[PDB]
Amino acid sequence: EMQLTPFLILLRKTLEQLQEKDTGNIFSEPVPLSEVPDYLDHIKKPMDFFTMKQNLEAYRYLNFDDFEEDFNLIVSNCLKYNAKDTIFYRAAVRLREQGGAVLRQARRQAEKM
Numbered sequence: 113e114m115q116l117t118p119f120l121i122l123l124r125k126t127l128e129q130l131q132e133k134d135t136g137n138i139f140s141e142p143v144p145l146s147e148v149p150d151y152l153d154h155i156k157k158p159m160d161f162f163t164m165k166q167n168l169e170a171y172r173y174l175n176f177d178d179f180e181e182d183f184n185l186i187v188s189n190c191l192k193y194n195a196k197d198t199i200f201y202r203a204a205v206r207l208r209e210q211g212g213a214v215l216r217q218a219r220r221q222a223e224k225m
């Protein structure tokens with residue numbers, strides 16, 4: 113029950129804030145299927161920040177949950193595919209942790225709309 117333009121402005125800002133937490137840029141683009149030939153074997157829906165940006169601008173995120181769901185996919189896919197003693201796994205835990213406050217604050221603002 114809100115206006116489209118301010119909401120998308122809020123999602124854009126939120127997405128940039130989330131991306132800022134990924135300092136190694138390991139989640140910026142789709143996992144390279146050419147480099148990881150077995151990836152799709154147990155990852156049913158790959159996700160990444162570039163794809164999220166495309167979805168946002170394609171008006172595919174019209175509520176906060178659908179945005180947050182794809183962010184959570186970035187994290188959960190990474191935890192699933194990689195062993196716990198890897199940099200990738202711990203980077204996903206860190207993103208989940210730091211992304212948490214970013215999402216909570218952004219949703220607060222959305223609920224004012």
Ligand SMILES: CCc1nnc2cc(C)c3ccc(OC)cc3n12
Nearest residue numbers: 138139143144147148190193194200
């Ligand atoms: C989030 C990126 C990712 N998640 N799991 C893996 C596993 C692998 C193997 C992987 C390899 C290269 C790479 O460049 C971004 C990302 C990779 N990766």
